Amino acid sequence: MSAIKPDMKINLRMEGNVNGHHFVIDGDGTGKPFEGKQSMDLEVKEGGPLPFAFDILTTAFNRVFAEYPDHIQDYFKQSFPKGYSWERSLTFEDGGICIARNDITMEGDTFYNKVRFHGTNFPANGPVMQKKTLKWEPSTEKMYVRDGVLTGDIHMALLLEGNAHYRCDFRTTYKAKEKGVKLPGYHFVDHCIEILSHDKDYNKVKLYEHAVAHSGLPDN
Numbered sequence: 454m455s456a457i458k459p460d461m462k463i464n465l466r467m468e469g470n471v472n473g474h475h476f477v478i479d480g481d482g483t484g485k486p487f488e489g490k491q492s493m494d495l496e497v498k499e500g501g502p503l504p505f506a507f508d509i510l511t512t513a514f515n516r517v518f519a520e521y522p523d524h525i526q527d528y529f530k531q532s533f534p535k536g537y538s539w540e541r542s543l544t545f546e547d548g549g550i551c552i553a554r555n556d557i558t559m560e561g562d563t564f565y566n567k568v569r570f571h572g573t574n575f576p577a578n579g580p581v582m583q584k585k586t587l588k589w590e591p592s593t594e595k596m597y598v599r600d601g602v603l604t605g606d607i608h609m610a611l612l613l614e615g616n617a618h619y620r621c622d623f624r625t626t627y628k629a630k631e632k633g634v635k636l637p638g639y640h641f642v643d644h645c646i647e648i649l650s651h652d653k654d655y656n657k658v659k660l661y662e663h664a665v666a667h668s669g670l671p672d673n
C-alpha cells in the first residue's frame with residue numbers, strides 16, 4: 454500500500470526569482486525515509502552566481518524524509534504512491550518575503566520534485582542580499598490541522614556573521630494527492646538542515662537534512 458523503500462533517489466528541479474533575479478537549480482540526491490535523513494547535490498543551471506544568500510532556498514530542496522514513530526500518523530508516507538504538494542510562506546523579520554511550492558511524485562525508487570520559489574522586498578543591505586548568512590539553526594515544526602488541511606508552523610532563524618540571528622516564520626500547508634488520506638493529530642517535527650560543502654560562489658552545494666517526529670512533552 455505504500456511502496457516507499459528504505460533507500461530512495463531524489464530528483465528535483467527548482468525555477469524561481471528573488472528580488473528580480475531569475476534562476477534555475479537542479480538536484481540529484483538520496484535519502485532514508487524511515488531514519489528521516491536525506492542528502493542532495495545541488496547545481497545552478499541559470500542565474501548563477503546567485504546575488505543572494507543560498508540559505509533562503511535550502512528548505513525548498515519532503516517531510517516523507519522524517520522519522521515518524523508508531524503512535525503518530527505519518528501523512529507523508531501515507532500519501533504515496535500518488536504523492537503530495539506543499540506550499541510555504543517564509544516571512545522574514547526585516548520585510549523579506551518568499552513563497553514556495555513543491556509538487557512531489559514517485560516513479561519506482563525516485564521521488565520527483567517540481568519546485569517554485571519567489572522572493573521580494575529583501576533589503577539591499579540586509580544579510581540575504583549581502584550574503585551574510587551562516588546556516589539555519591535546527592528547528593521544531595508544529596503540525597496541526599486547520600480546516601481539513603495539515604499545516605506546519607516554524608519559528609526559523611538564520612545564524613549570521615557574529616552569532617546574530619535573522620528571524621523567519623514558516624507556515625506550510627501539506628496536501629495529499631489522493632482524497633481522504635487520514636489527517637494526523639497535533640504533533641512536532643524537529644529538523645536540522647546543513648550545507649555540508651559548497652563551492653565558492655555556491656553554484657555547487659551539498660545539502661543534508663535530518664528530521665524526527667514526536668508528540669512533545671511528556672512523551673518525547
Ligand SMILES: O=S([O-])[O-]
Nearest residue numbers: 645646647661663
Ligand atoms: O545533525 S547535523 O549537524 O548533521
Ligand SMILES: O=S([O-])[O-]
Nearest residue numbers: 669670671672673
Ligand atoms: O502529560 S503531562 O501532564 O505531564
